[PDB]
From a paper:
In the CU pathway, a dedicated chaperone facilitates the folding of pilus subunits in the periplasm and an integral outer membrane (OM) protein termed the usher provides the assembly platform and secretion channel for the pilus fiber. Periplasmic chaperone–subunit complexes are then recruited to the OM usher (PapC for P pili, FimD for type 1 pili) for subunit assembly into pili and secretion of the pilus fiber to the cell surface. Ushers contain five domains: a central 24-stranded ß-barrel domain that inserts into the OM to form the secretion channel, an internal plug domain that forms the channel gate, a periplasmic N-terminal domain (NTD) that functions in subunit recruitment, and two tandem periplasmic C-terminal domains (CTD1 and CTD2) that function in pilus assembly and secretion. Using cryo-electron microscopy (EM), we determined structures of the activated PapC usher in the process of secreting two- and three-subunit P pilus assembly intermediates.
To generate a two-subunit intermediate, we replaced the PapK NTE with the NTE from PapF (PapKF-NTE) and deleted papE and papF, resulting in a ∆EF P pilus tip fiber composed only of PapK bound to PapG. For the two-subunit ∆EF dataset, starting with over one million particles, after 2D and 3D classifications, we derived two 3D maps, named Conformers II and III, at 3.8 Å and 7.2 Å, respectively. In the ∆EF cryo-EM structures (Conformers II and III), the PapF subunit is not present and instead PapK is directly engaged in DSE (by its engineered PapF NTE) with the pilin domain of PapG. The lectin domain of PapG in Conformers II and III has not yet fully transited through the usher channel and the PapG pilin domain is still located on the periplasmic side of the usher. In Conformers II and III, the PapC plug domain, NTD, and CTDs are resolved in the 3D maps and reside on the periplasmic side of the β-barrel channel. In the Conformer II ∆EF structure, the usher NTD is bound to the N-terminal end of the first lobe of PapD, as in Conformer I, but here CTD2 of the PapC usher is visible. CTD2 is bound to PapD in a never-before-seen binding site at the vertex of the boomerang, where CTD2 primarily interacts with the C-terminal end of the first lobe of PapD. Due to this binding and stabilization of CTD2, we propose that Conformer II follows Conformer I in the chaperone–subunit recruitment and handover cycle that takes place on the periplasmic domains of the usher. The interactions between PapC CTD2 and PapD are more complicated: in Conformer II, F732 and W767 of CTD2 interact hydrophobically with A119 and I120 of PapD, respectively; in Conformer III, F732 and W767 of CTD2 form hydrophobic interactions with I46, I51, and P73 of PapD. (4) Next, the handover of PapDF from the NTD to the CTDs is initiated by binding of CTD2 to the midpoint of the PapD chaperone (Conformer II).
Residue numbers in the entry:
A (entry chain K): 23 to 178
B (entry chain G): 21 to 336
C (entry chain C): 1 to 644, 648 to 808
D (entry chain D): 1 to 215
The structure:
Amino acid sequence: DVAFRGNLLDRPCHVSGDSLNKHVVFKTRASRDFWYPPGRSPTESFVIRLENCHATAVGKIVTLTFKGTEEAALPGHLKVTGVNAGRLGIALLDTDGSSLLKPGTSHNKGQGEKVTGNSLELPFGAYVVATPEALRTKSVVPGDYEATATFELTYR
Amino acid sequence: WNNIVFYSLGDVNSYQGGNVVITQRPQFITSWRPGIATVTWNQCNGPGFADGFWAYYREYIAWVVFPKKVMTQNGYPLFIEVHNKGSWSEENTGDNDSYFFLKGYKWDERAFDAGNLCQKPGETTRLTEKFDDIIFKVALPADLPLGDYSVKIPYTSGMQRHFASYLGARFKIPYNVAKTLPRENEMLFLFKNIGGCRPSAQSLEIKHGDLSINSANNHYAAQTLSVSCDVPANIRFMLLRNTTPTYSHGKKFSVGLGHGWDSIVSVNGVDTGETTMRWYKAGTQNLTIGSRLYGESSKIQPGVLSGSATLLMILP
Amino acid sequence: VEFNTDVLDAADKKNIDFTRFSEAGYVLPGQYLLDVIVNGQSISPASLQISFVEPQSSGDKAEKKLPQACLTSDMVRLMGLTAESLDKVVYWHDGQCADFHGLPGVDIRPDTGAGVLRINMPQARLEYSDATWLPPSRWDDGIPGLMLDYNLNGTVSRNYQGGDSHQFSYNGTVGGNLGPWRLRADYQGSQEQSRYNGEKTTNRNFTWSRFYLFRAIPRWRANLTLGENNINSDIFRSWSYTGASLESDDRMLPPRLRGYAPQITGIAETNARVVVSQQGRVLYDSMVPAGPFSIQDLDSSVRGRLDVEVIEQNGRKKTFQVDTASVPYLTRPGQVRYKLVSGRSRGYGHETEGPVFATGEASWGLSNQWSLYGGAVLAGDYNALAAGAGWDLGVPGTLSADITQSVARIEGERTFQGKSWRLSYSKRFDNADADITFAGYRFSERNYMTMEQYLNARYRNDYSSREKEMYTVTLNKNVADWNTSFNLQYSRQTYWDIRKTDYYTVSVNRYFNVFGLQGVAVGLSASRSKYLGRDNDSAYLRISVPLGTGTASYSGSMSNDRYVNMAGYTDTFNDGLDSYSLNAGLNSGGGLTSQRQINAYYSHRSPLANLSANIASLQKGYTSFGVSASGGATITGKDAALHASGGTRLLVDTDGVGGVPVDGGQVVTNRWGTGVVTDISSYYRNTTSVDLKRLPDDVEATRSVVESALTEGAIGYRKFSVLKGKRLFAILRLADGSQPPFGASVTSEKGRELGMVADEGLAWLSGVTPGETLSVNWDGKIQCQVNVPETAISDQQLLLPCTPQ
Amino acid sequence: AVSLDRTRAVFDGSEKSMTLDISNDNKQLPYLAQAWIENENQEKIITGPVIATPPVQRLEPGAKSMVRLSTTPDISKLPQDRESLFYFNLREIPPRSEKANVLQIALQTKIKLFYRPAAIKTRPNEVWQDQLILNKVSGGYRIENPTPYYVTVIGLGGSEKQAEEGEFETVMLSPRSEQTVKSANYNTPYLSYINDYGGRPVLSFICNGSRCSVK
């Protein structure tokens, strides 16, 4: 009797194992830090882990772009979705820390992407900011605010 | 006086036995044929010629000597035994090599003819006597290998004549000179052995998944093949190499599935390649064809892996 | 735990439910394709439909529940459940969720993550149904039709008396299956002719050996047999008869349940894990129920020590060795084995009649590893009661015995009363491997009379050959690292008015190698029949030397002062189907003559029929060249066919293709599009698949494996959706230049689907021979014809014209 | 977070349902992966040609699950002489934490679902990318796709250190078409690509000045 052995196989293009419970918090007040001119909370540095089977490049394997709901009163920001509905916004920074990128544009490859071995760490900065129509009029209230940003890793 | 002249037949009959199993016993017909025949044993104690003018009694008894055990062309015994003996009279069954069949069809008649009462060994006469049939079932032995067979059974079947001179004469040939008769009549029979051993699946498909490379470096895929017998044989199977293996994994039977991916075959847990099992009666057993996919020297090249490993079961 | 579905799931809410799965770990009711596992095995290989819907059956105040697998009646019909005894799945309609609350211990854990549906049930709630045994509610019975099985061997001959060569064998097996009722008629004869100078004799004998009907019965798990057959040499010897026979079959019974092995008993504390190894291989590894347990399902092949080990849930152990007997009459504890046979006694002629009888021979075992076995033979002028028990004592071996009080009333005013008893013995696996396979002792009398002696005494006046005593001892011994199968045996029979007959047969199967590969076998034997004055010292010798590509054999034999030797070269060919031998021999007999045998053969296992030729010659008989044909046919099926049988046959139907190879016996099909595989066993799981590597390049097989279990002597239907032809795209250009809409079913003239059109003539037609005309059918009617040239090859986008009519 | 073993799922026209397994690398908190299949212009067509059989499914920490893709008449209402593209994407919803002022991140993936019809069904190791040709443009290059399957180039270079390591933007190729790509002129450009399986082989192009292909 012929016992031929046939199969299929693949390789796991996925995320690394160092940072699983990644949730950034903000220990900043709302009634004091958002009633004066600049309305910003301190930046919280968080990184994005990448253990793929080929660490030769970044744009030739992963086209990182991020989506989500956009803030109406603030162009270039995300919706906060909480007690301060429309009064606060979500800012986001790249690896250089100065390029205030847009909700829907792709990540600019070629810069600030240190290939630490077979991994690929992408540090990002995000701090909650207020819309100037609610900042100057001082209509923001203190409370709980939970925002969510979706980062699609559309591969090649 | 009592004269006996043995006259043996010359029939060479054939029959195809078909494709049988070891537990199955094929039945065959050994007919009586009234054809050409030749003398094999001559005696003279009384007169040598006759003109038919004296009183002489006649009797004629059939003589069939068939073998019980018979060796093969490879040296195996075939226990041929009777289920129905026909209208004959089987006697002297205490012998180990041969049966002795008899039939009294002509046992009391007076003749009036001019003949030769004791013929020489170079003699041929006419024989036209329709007799009853006889039948046998070949009870095959336990151990018998695969293939075709050309077994010939030795048999002396032939009408003897008993010449006497008085009314009420009873005389048969003694069995040791009847069993030390020449190997004249053969039988050309062929029968194909398909073997008592057979698997139940007849093709092995092992459902192993669409997996990642980290679990591809060490994975276990198992499939059980059930072999079911009704004979106490001791089988042996060889995992025959069919495709090209890539990596030299030592003593372990590596099956290269292609695209830089070998896989060893683990029969019953260990990587032996061949195992040893004894069976004692009718039943079945299980053999797990395990597979370990470590065919990697850390130069990974993913492809469709579709090798083969045919196992052939040979009866030793 | 509540999830973050309040932010977004998508741009809009999908409105299904969004909190229920979060708190209840609930699965969404949809169309899933799952594999259903019942107690570790699978009821289907590629199971398509498993539905999930929400049960709105039970009313409540909270109304928060979990969905379950909505199994309909067909997959619970093929689940192997005993619906006859438990009618809790009979009454179920497909509208509501099928609950299994009426049965105890049934848990259904649907884990869609692993793609499996595990169902765990107690063994008494369902049938046997393992990986190789389909249940008795699903037996693929035969289709109506007949069969012919021929065996012909014609040969020539050469003698010393003139010139003579004309011989033709005639064997055969006909029959017709009419539903479950199966007819069988085996005819065997011969056709010989002799042409001497002064005499030309010939004869033509042909006789129907056996006429019988047999209908398999699943409910009783035993086959009745009406017609002619024999009663095996069980207590009484072989005696032919015509009539009815309700014999208990063993092939209808599972293969791990055949024969004898005792049930493992004991009650320790909980759901333990049993493990029983015979020689380094586990025969049974599962979880027993909590409390008392008894394994009636283990009745496999074991002839010695078996350390049946129990391992509990906490980790406690207990070890005890139990013992088997393997005697021919003790069976499974709880179930029976029987033979209910009746009819008229056949003599030697075909139209021979006689007395009418009713003989019942049964064997039943109580469950304290004991068993009784009785026989009640009763005819109008002859009665014979047989009764007796057999039991395994364990450590001193095993016993069995019976009493037989036969009363024989002959018509000569002599009533014959005889009480004959016989005893049986065997032995287990010793440490130094001593095994007594059989040890009998038959105490009979001057007045013993079985059925065959009463048959010979009623009309043929035979009054000889009755056994007084018959006792044999048969020890068998194997030895590791020596590999010699020692088996000495000695019997001493004694007949009435005849003296004693002592037998002495020793044998040894030596297995070792010198200058060759391992697998070389050496056989030796010695036979000695001891009478009062003579001792027939017979000795047969066997030498078998294989070398992979060659298998040489040497056989020496000596009946009585005749040293006869033979040397063989039997071997297969490179394909495995053919085989050829070349063998010579020497025959130096006691009768002053030295003969030289020469035998050769050349077989060829062709897929239409088996064929072989044989060269055979000796001294005083020369050059007998012959041709042996052995094949068979199956007419009244779908189409007729021709094959490589002694029973059941599966009919594989692959329409349109001429030469597709099927597995089992490597049988190819014919011009009519059918084939019949013959190397199949009865009542087993038969996976008849095509050999997917050796197909022709013009044909393709979409799905290859189909499943069913055939009855003994049945013909089974298996359709095969195969296709023959090329791969094309017929870009159509009509008379007006248009293109018709979708659903244009392109169909061949034989009645086979080829494909359909998508939007503008891009119809992928598959399985088309070059040089035909098809039927493109849209709106349920024929509208246009086409014409394919011979020039069309595979993977083309050829300019096909659609000529209308 | 979830993980996908496929870098591009290939769906052959023979079997009506392929399997596609996902896993859960987290061992502290669960997740629920919900999936859908888009097309070339990227919209959530809820009742399109191919549908993911589990729409929303809870995943235990450390567990794994499969997402099967069933078959409708709309995949027959697609071209058979070429392939078809589809975008399989999936989101993950994490559980609501009790802490306040927490910003959440969803590390999601979108994969290319390659529908392959049964009419152009391929052999297990038939590399159709061997038939690819490249033409020289005065200021760059143009790659051509004669094969009816979707292929993807990722880099061109002269030596082994600069094709898949250089600063080069990748491009998607369509069946029976072509497109221009600006790059430096190489005498022997080796084709660095990614197949449907997931591996990254390399193959050389030997030309006669303008048009090149394999040996």
